[PDB]
């Protein structure tokens, strides 16, 4: 699960949207995702 | 003459030799040894001396400054230092003492300036045939 | 376009009394800055005056300076003074405002006032709320004690207590040179000491990861044969811990000892001051001497 990463250090983030892409999300948000994609797929001899 | 206390090893003196000769523009000649009689004079011995101490003042020095500073950094570039000092960590206090690690460190870059920097006093543009001479416009 | 003017006059549009003048006839030859050029200015902006400010930061006063031209003073007439801009290499005459002790030979560096003494020496035209404030010329050794000062403060600020903090900064901003006693005024820890503080943590950085063993190696193996009065002081700073080299190779030596050159002018470059003037004469009273001027 978790993943392994080159740098050993993290840094700070000091750019828009528009030029970088960061991911990041709060956990609340991560598991209402997980089960409205969960309902959705569903819904969709 | 940062070799001077390695000199009885072949290897050394091979090293030595090496470093003696130097080559130029259709010209080779070798320089004399700063060691004489299996010892150093106190002027190269305080140069020497003043290189190491700043090398080591600054490798135990660095890492509390670049770790506390490092955390503010809008440049990203200090979390880099911190995590070059911390590679080479791996390959391997009193107020008062503290100041005077620091005063100490600094005192010992001055003493170096001679060695470290230098500034040209001619720029030449003419040349004759008989080269011994040429003129130039002075810098001072 | 208009050249730059060499020669400039500055007229007081405040009303001077005889005193006033008579003081302004003892500045001949002294350094002034000013903020711009032109033929006919008006003395609000000559002097240091014009740049203080609620901030009170010494090093911010110490950068405004660094960008202000230089002009000697010619000589006074009524109500009008004129300036002369000095060209680099020529011979020139200057007048030692401030109480620091100059020399034969030596260097001098344009830098902020630091009070001496009984701090009663401002008599320098005060009218309208207006004052002659004037830069001091010092030698090379102060302004690096100076600068020096400076920024271990800023470095020793980090992560120490307060309070100890305070008494290192009671006990740094006092400096005893060539037989007087001066002070740091306002030693404030802002933004500007804070750049020179990562530029000299990143140059330190870098000279950490530079070094060869041999430079790391040299004082510790020096202690084993060696000993001096030198070197017991030299290593009472260190952390306290036959063989033969375990790699040598010159050319690498070469190329690393070319980059921490490199480093160590980046690292030195912070508390050096440029030189304006080289010296070689002196009035017997210390008042005046003769200089070439260079930058």
Request: proline letters at 5%.
């Amino acid at each position: 699960s978790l993943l392994h990463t080159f740098w050993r250090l993290p840094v700070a983030v000091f750019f828009e949207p528009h030029e970088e892409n960061v991911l990041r999300c709060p956990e609340r948000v991560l598991r209402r995702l997980l089960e409205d994609a969960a309902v959705t797929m569903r819904g969709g001899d | 003459g940062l070799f001077s206390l390695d000199r009885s090893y072949e290897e050394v003196k091979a090293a030595v030799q090496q470093l003696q000769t130097i080559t130029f523009r259709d010209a080779t000649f070798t320089i004399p040894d700063p060691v004489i009689d299996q010892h150093l004079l106190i002027d190269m011995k305080t140069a020497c001396l003043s290189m190491s101490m700043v090398a080591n003042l600054a490798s135990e020095l660095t890492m509390t400054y670049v770790r506390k500073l490092a955390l503010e950094d809008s440049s990203m570039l200090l979390v880099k230092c911190q995590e070059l000092l911390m590679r080479l960590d791996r390959e391997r206090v009193s107020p008062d003492d503290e100041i005077a690690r620091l005063s100490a460190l600094f005192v010992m870059l001055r003493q170096l300036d001679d060695l470290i920097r230098e500034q040209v006093v001619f720029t030449v543009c003419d040349v004759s045939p008989d080269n011994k001479s040429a003129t130039c416009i002075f810098k001072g | 376009m208009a050249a730059m003017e060499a020669n400039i006059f500055c007229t007081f549009d405040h009303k001077l009394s005889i005193a006033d003048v008579g003081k302004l006839t003892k500045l001949v030859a002294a350094v002034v800055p000013i903020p711009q050029r032109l033929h006919l200015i008006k003395h609000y902006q000559l002097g240091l005056h014009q740049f203080v400010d609620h901030t009170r930061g010494y090093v911010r006063l110490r950068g405004l300076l660094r960008n202000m031209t230089l002009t000697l003073m010619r000589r006074v007439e009524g109500n009008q003074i004129l300036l002369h801009v000095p060209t680099h290499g020529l011979l020139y005459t200057v007048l030692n405002t401030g109480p620091v002790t100059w020399e034969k030979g030596d260097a001098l560096c344009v830098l902020p006032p630091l009070f001496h003494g009984p701090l009663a020496r401002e008599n320098l035209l005060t009218l309208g709320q207006w004052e002659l404030v004037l830069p001091w010329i010092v030698p090379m050794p102060l302004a690096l004690e100076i600068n020096q000062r400076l920024l271990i403060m800023g470095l020793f600020s980090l992560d120490r207590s307060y309070e100890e903090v305070k008494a290192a900064v009671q006990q740094l901003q006092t400096i005893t040179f060539r037989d007087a006693t001066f002070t740091i005024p306002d030693p404030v820890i802002d933004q500007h000491l804070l750049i020179d503080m990562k530029t000299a943590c990143l140059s330190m950085s870098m000279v950490a990861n530079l070094a060869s063993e041999l430079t790391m190696t040299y004082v510790r193996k020096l202690a084993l044969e060696d000993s001096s009065m030198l070197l017991v002081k030299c290593q009472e700073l260190l952390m306290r811990l036959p063989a033969r080299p375990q790699h040598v190779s010159p050319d690498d030596e070469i190329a690393r000892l070319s980059a921490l050159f490199v480093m160590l002018r980046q690292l030195d470059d912070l508390i050096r001051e440029q030189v304006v003037f080289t010296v070689c004469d002196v009035s017997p009273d210390n008042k005046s001497a003769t200089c070439i001027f260079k930058g």
